[PDB]
């Protein structure tokens, strides 16, 4: 009798961990974009310019 | 407690410079201690005792 | 006969384990949105601003 | 009748948690080595050099 | 009848899960104080000092 239930709740544990992992993976993706963008943009700003002759 | 395991390696392992040494002390139960070091690039005659890890 | 009850209580045991699983699936849903939004929003905040030229 | 099964599955819970713990303990060990190595090596690189006279 | 045992073992299962929960609540308490103090103290250390004028 006991055995049956153990299996069922195990399935839930798996799925819930999976769902949480998805958040972390996705979020990391979302940040990757902006992280790079910010650095490149900021460098081009400080480095570039024109000078009166 | 602190205690020193003493090993004489003079003929058994050939620890010249730049040599990697790997290992473990494994107890009857419980997690092993991990030994992991690379001998220095240069041994000096003024400093016969060396700190390896 | 003993068998009769063993069957009936199994039916219950399954059902309870289902209900217990459900709450975790549901709650994971609720948390998903809340988490994702919190990250996005916080990012935009730090990343943005204005600068007075002259 | 019910009692018997409860005991059996309890045993499994124990062993499965044990196996998972082993991963975490071991992995921490595996990383400890490389973590230290990287720091020492990197410092020796930035600090050392020769100079033309 | 099978039902009798099912009831009794449930009583046990609840109680064990309670004890298990307790240790985490307790431990979180212990850690709370230790953490908070460590931060405060460390901050004051860096922030403070004396300077010889003349």
Quickly count helices (H) and strands (E) in chain E. 1, 0
> Cα distance from D8 to chain E (closest Cα, Å)?
14
- Three-state SS for chain A is CHHHHHHHHHHHHHHHHHHHHHHHHHHHHHHHHHHHHHHHHHHHHHHCCCCCC
CA neighbor of E8 nearest in space, from B7, D12, D2, C32: D2
Q: How was this structure determined?
A: cryo-EM
Residues 6+ apart with CB under 8 A from C31: A20
CA neighbor of B31 nearest in space, from D25, C15, D43: D25
- What residue in C sits closest to E7 (Cα-Cα)? C9
- What residue in A sits closest to D13 (Cα-Cα)? A6
Give the number of other Cβ atoms within 10 Å of residue A27's Cβ. 16
Phi, psi of C4 (to 5 degrees): -55, -50
- Measured between beta carbons, the chain A residues lying within 8 angstroms of C16 are 5
E6: contact with D, CB 8 A cutoff: yes
> Cα distance from D14 to chain B (closest Cα, Å)?
16
Q: What distance in Å separates the CA atoms of residue B36 and residue B33, rounded to the nearest whole number?
A: 10
Q: What distance in Å separates the CA atoms of residue A36 and residue A32, rounded to the nearest whole number?
A: 6
Chains D and A touch (3+ CB pairs under 8 A): yes
Most D CBs within 10 Å, among E3, E5, E16, to test the D interface: E5
- Measured between beta carbons, the chain E residues lying within 8 angstroms of C5 are 1-3
Resolution of this entry, Å: 3.1
D9 vs A2: CB contact, 8 Å cut-off? yes
- Measured between beta carbons, the chain B residues lying within 8 angstroms of D36 are 53
- Three-state SS for chain C is CCHHHHHHHHHHHHHHHHHHHHHHHHHHHHHHHHHHHHHHHHHHHHHCCCCCCC
Give the number of other Cβ atoms within 10 Å of residue C17's Cβ. 19
- Farthest-apart Cα atoms in chain C, separation: 94
How far apart, in Å, are the Cα atoms of C1 and each of C6, D9, E1? 10, 26, 9
Chains in contact with D, counting 3 or more C-beta pairs less than 8 Å apart as contact: A, B, E
């Amino acid at each position: 009798a006991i055995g049956i239930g153990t299996l069922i709740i195990f399935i839930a544990m798996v799925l819930v961990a999976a769902v949480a992992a998805a958040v972390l993976i996705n979020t990391s993706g979302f940040l990757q974009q902006k992280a790079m963008a910010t650095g490149k943009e900021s460098t081009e700003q400080v480095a570039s310019g024109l000078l009166c002759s | 407690d602190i205690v020193a395991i003493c090993l004489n390696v003079s003929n058994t392992l050939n620890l010249k410079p730049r040599t990697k040494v790997t290992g473990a002390v494994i107890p009857e139960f419980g997690a092993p201690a991990v030994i992991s070091f690379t001998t220095p690039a240069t041994y000096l005659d003024t400093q016969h005792i060396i700190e390896l890890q | 006969a003993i068998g009769i009850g063993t069957l009936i209580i199994f039916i219950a045991m399954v059902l309870v384990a289902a209900v217990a699983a459900a709450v975790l699936i549901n709650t994971s849903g609720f948390l998903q949105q809340k988490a994702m939004a919190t990250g996005k929003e916080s990012t935009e905040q730090v990343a943005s601003g204005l600068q007075v030229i002259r």
